[PDB]
Write a protein that binds this ligand. Structure first.
Ligand SMILES: O=c1oc2c(O)c(O)cc3c(=O)oc4c(O)c(O)cc1c4c23
Ligand SMILES: N[C@@H](CCC(=O)N[C@@H](CS)C(=O)NCC(=O)O)C(=O)O
Ligand SMILES: N[C@@H](CCC(=O)N[C@@H](CS)C(=O)NCC(=O)O)C(=O)O
Ligand SMILES: [Cl-]
Ligand SMILES: [Cl-]
Ligand code: NA
Ligand code: NA
Lengths: 216, 216
């Protein structure tokens, strides 16, 4: 079974977990806890990784790091990255537009100045969300009628910004519908209700936003 | 002919420019100068872009944004993204490892405390560069004998960190060699002496590091 290694947090790997659960792929999750930073440091250069980091993905055929390389590899092995340069580029464009939101959060979540930085991020967020709302006015999922890895990336981003402001999706009914649609996929619904789901933290435990042992 | 739209800076699109010149592709670059933000705002939503942003790339088949979608599309049109999931994932892993460096710079380059933040980045930089130095010990380019788009991404990142610290590659002879090897590619050599080459700025003009109209 492939091994997925990461901290016991959502962070960079949550979209990858959602994709694996949608595919019903068996995988072995190797998780590092809040106080296991030393265990990681003693294993980091002992795994055969060319660019040692978390997350990592090991399946015998490959030893990968970089969260986007890993999610794309899993999608690629299941023939989901797109059928021609045009479709593959549309999927990569969706990826990058989601990362603008998700890194917008992570960039400020460890700052002691978070409560002021959050205000600026939430003022810029609507312009980004509007582009996805428009994209979803004619399509069921981000790439049309079938699920692609960016849909799970967007789901993760929406989950995270709703912790920052539970009202930030009120002006975007298509995004509220999209989020409920992902949750209604049978594999996802079972996963999210199960003990396998990691609901918290969103970032590292030391983060000012999305850290700690429990949601506030 | 394809149109590439961006600010008249290196920024997010320099590796794409290098790739297009390496491939000897015909393209038109439409640049926005320091005082042309109004020009961009007047056409941002009139170009048919689904996720309007800079850079944009428009050809007869696609209207793209997101700098990484654009570079991947150009590579994909020339069959350079990788021959199997394993090779495509290694190229994506190299991408992400370069972006760790390049965004490490951009994250701090606009801060008025750049002089203090720089120190931490330059402290982390050697262990990031060491992974590339090791990769080039057994391969000519990052993916082997042939150039891939991550090679031009790495070139761009080395050019930028050398402005931050001229000595930061002194401990990495293979990276010093790699930078000169890219500059020796005849298409790149000619590009660097052409009217199209943008030598400065590295970031937006308003950046504390890599901004202004000329280098320090
Ligand atoms: O601040 C950022 O840090 C990053 C990284 O440190 C990185 O390794 C990759 C990325 C990336 O791919 O996309 C990004 C964005 O679209 C964005 O708006 C901000 C950031 C990043 C980013
Ligand atoms: N660009 C990399 C970033 C990886 C990263 O920053 N990982 C953090 C956790 S979110 C870490 O703890 N890395 C372990 C290390 O550097 O030793 C990716 O997307 O995978
Ligand atoms: N993740 C996006 C970031 C794009 C971005 O931030 N572009 C800046 C310049 S570096 C911009 O000026 N966008 C114009 C706008 O937002 O209207 C990418 O890689 O292309
Ligand atoms: Cl705590
Ligand atoms: Cl100036
Ligand atoms: Na706590
Ligand atoms: Na100046």
């Amino acid at each position: 079974s492939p091994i997925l290694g990461y901290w016991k947090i959502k962070g960079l790997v949550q979209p990858t977990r959602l994709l694996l659960e949608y595919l019903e792929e068996k995988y072995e999750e190797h998780l590092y806890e809040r106080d296991e930073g030393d265990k990681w440091r003693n294993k980091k250069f002992e795994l055969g990784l060319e660019f040692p980091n978390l997350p990592y993905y090991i399946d015998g055929d490959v030893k990968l790091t970089q969260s986007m390389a890993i999610i794309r590899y899993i999608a690629d092995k299941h023939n989901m990255l797109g059928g021609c340069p045009k479709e593959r580029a549309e999927i990569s464009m969706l990826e990058g537009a989601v990362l603008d939101i998700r890194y917008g959060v992570s960039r400020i979540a460890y700052s002691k100045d978070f409560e002021t930085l959050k205000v600026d991020f939430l003022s810029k967020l609507p312009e980004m969300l509007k582009m996805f709302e428009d994209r979803l006015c004619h399509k069921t999922y981000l790439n049309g009628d079938h699920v692609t890895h960016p849909d799970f990336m967007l789901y993760d981003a929406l989950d995270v910004v709703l912790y920052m402001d539970p009202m930030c999706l009120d002006a975007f009914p298509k995004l509220v519908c999209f989020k409920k649609r992902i949750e209604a996929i049978p594999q996802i619904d079972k996963y999210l209700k199960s003990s396998k789901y990691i609901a918290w933290p969103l970032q590292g435990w030391q983060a000012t936003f999305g850290g700690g042992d429990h949601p506030p």
